[PDB]
């Protein structure tokens, strides 16, 4: 009886194994665009992905992860609200059974078809494991997906999902350029929060880009053909792998833009 997204192991159950699920800085949240304050002191966000090295794509039974080589400072997030350098380790998505849901963060209660998380850890703490134990250990760059025109730089990812249908399957995934997944604008909201899956550690600076990327119906459809179950188990489609909005409590969301 492991945590998941079902009727009996879903987000309303997580607090039983992970009490921090009810804590003071949980993610995701609703972004109330009228309440977020412009902070003219937020530096521009710095995304240096030119030297990025992808290695592998993994179905972990909750999402798929594109893993990167993070043993050197090749793909880094800096500036914005961050002090110091955060190394890309992996990206993953959350998505819906239908285009009207899937995002974890919402904008004035609006759900997007999916949400991309580019996960980075603070180099000051030496590895990912130690960073998750720190209030400023991680920076997750959240990018909303809406359904329209295809995202060409996503197609390499969509085409390998056949090879990682079930939990525990992985495929070599070298030379994937994550710059293909960014929107034009780097305008963002930022707020202190948590991992959105167990163990729900309160170790994240969230940076959510205002501007969503467009993907095609056929692109998200291929996300929805993935399985939560392992090979030779009953088929449960990997859909609605998203945690709903959590109480904002004693937090301000700042905007990088007027
Ligand atoms: N959806 S999200 O962007 O908020 C997000 C959710 C989970 C992760 N987590 C990763 S990559 N590791 C696996 C779980 C945490 O690891 C630990 C590693 C060691 C000890 C304790 C925990 C990262 C981002
Ligand atoms: Zn995530």
**Where are the domains positioned within the chain?**
1-258
129: left (phi over 0), alpha (psi -120 to 50) or beta: alpha
- Output the residue whose Cα is nearest ligand 1's atom 1: 196
Closest-lying ligand 1 atom to the alpha carbon of residue 89: 11
Distance 50 CA to ligand 1 centre (A): 24
Distance 119 CA to ligand 2 centre (A): 8
Contact indicator for 146, 211 with CB cutoff of 8 Å: no
- Apex CA 253: angle with CA 250 and CA 257, to 5°? 160
Cα Dmax for the chain: 55
**Bridge partners for 87 per DSSP:** 76, 121
Among 119, 144, 201, 245, which is best to mutate for testing ligand 1, by the most ligand atoms less than 8 A from CB? 119
Measured in degrees and rounded to the nearest 5, phi and psi for residue 107 equal: -120, 110
**Ligand 1 residue neighbourhood (C-beta within 6 Å):** 90, 117, 119, 129, 132, 140, 195-197, 199
Q: Is the dihedral of CA 209, 211, 217, 218 positive or negative?
A: negative
C-alpha distance across the termini of the chain, in Å: 47
Decide the pairing of beta strands 30-31 and 213-215. unpaired
Report the candidate in 97, 256, 116 with the shortest Cα–Cα distance to residue 191. 256
CA distances from 245 to 9, 20, 110 (A): 18, 15, 11
Q: Indicate the DSSP class of residue 227.
A: B
**Resolution, expressed in angstroms to one decimal:** 2.0
d(CA 208, CA 163): 30
Closest-lying ligand 1 atom to the alpha carbon of residue 94: 1
3-state secondary structure the chain: CCCCCCCCCCCCCHHHCCHHHHCCCCCCCEECCCCCEECCCCCCEEEECCCCCEEEEEECCCCEEEEECCCCCCCEEEECCCCCCEEEEEEEEEECCCCCCCCCCEECCECCCEEEEEEEEEHHHCCHHHHCCCCCCEEEEEEEEEECCCCHHHHHHHHHHHHHCCECCEEECCCCCHHHHCCCCCCEEEEEECCCCCCCCCCEEEEEECCCEEECHHHHHHHCCCECCECCCCCCECCCCCCCCCCCCCCCCEECCC
Distance 218 CA to ligand 2 centre (A): 22
For 161, the token pair is 């999902």
The set of residues, in sequence order, having a beta carbon less than 8 Å from that of 40 and lying 6+ positions away, is: none
d(CA 78, CA 239): 32
For 61, the token pair is 């039974």
- Output the residue whose Cα is nearest ligand 1's atom 6: 195
Report the candidate in 90, 109, 117 with the shortest Cα–Cα distance to residue 195. 117
Q: Indicate the DSSP class of residue 219.
A: H
Decide the pairing of beta strands 76-79 and 213-215. unpaired
For 145, the token pair is 């997906």
Decide the pairing of beta strands 106-107 and 30-31. parallel
d(CA 158, CA 202): 31
CA distances from 169 to 110, 159, 161, 254 (A): 33, 15, 10, 39
The set of residues, in sequence order, having a beta carbon less than 8 Å from that of 192 and lying 6+ positions away, is: 25, 135, 202, 204, 205, 206, 251
Task: Give the method used.
Answer: X-ray
- Burial of 143-168, coded b for 16+ CB within 10 Å and e otherwise, reads bbbbbeeebeebebbbebbeebebbe
**Bridge partners for 167 per DSSP:** 230
Residue 120 annotated as catalytic: no
Decide the pairing of beta strands 213-215 and 138-147. parallel
């Amino acid at each position: 009886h492991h945590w998941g997204y079902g009727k009996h192991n879903g987000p309303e159950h997580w607090h039983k194994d992970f009490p921090i699920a009810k804590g003071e800085r949980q993610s995701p949240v609703d972004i109330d665009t009228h309440t977020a304050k412009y902070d003219p002191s937020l530096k521009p966000l710095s995304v240096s992905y030119d030297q990025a090295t992808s290695l592998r794509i993994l179905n972990n039974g909750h999402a798929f992860n594109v893993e990167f080589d993070d043993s050197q400072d090749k793909a880094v997030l800096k500036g914005g609200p961050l002090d110091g350098t955060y190394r890309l380790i992996q990206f993953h998505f959350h998505w819906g059974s239908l285009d009207g849901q899937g995002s974890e963060h919402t904008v004035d209660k609006k759900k997007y078809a999916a949400e991309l998380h580019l996960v980075h850890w603070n180099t000051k703490y030496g590895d990912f494991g130690k960073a998750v134990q720190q209030p400023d250990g991680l920076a997750v760059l959240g990018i909303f997906l809406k359904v329209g025109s295809a995202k060409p730089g996503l197609q390499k990812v969509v085409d390998v999902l056949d090879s990682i249908k079930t939990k525990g399957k992985s495929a070599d995934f070298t030379n994937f350029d994550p710059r293909g997944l960014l929107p034009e604008s780097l305008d963002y909201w930022t707020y202190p929060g948590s991992l959105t899956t167990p163990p729900l550690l309160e170790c994240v600076t969230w940076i959510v880009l205002k501007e969503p990327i467009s993907v095609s119906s056929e692109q998200v459809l291929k996300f929805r053909k993935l399985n939560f179950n392992g090979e030779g188990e009953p088929e449960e489609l990997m859909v609605d792998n998203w945690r709903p909005a959590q109480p904002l409590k004693n937090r301000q969301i700042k905007a990088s833009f007027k």
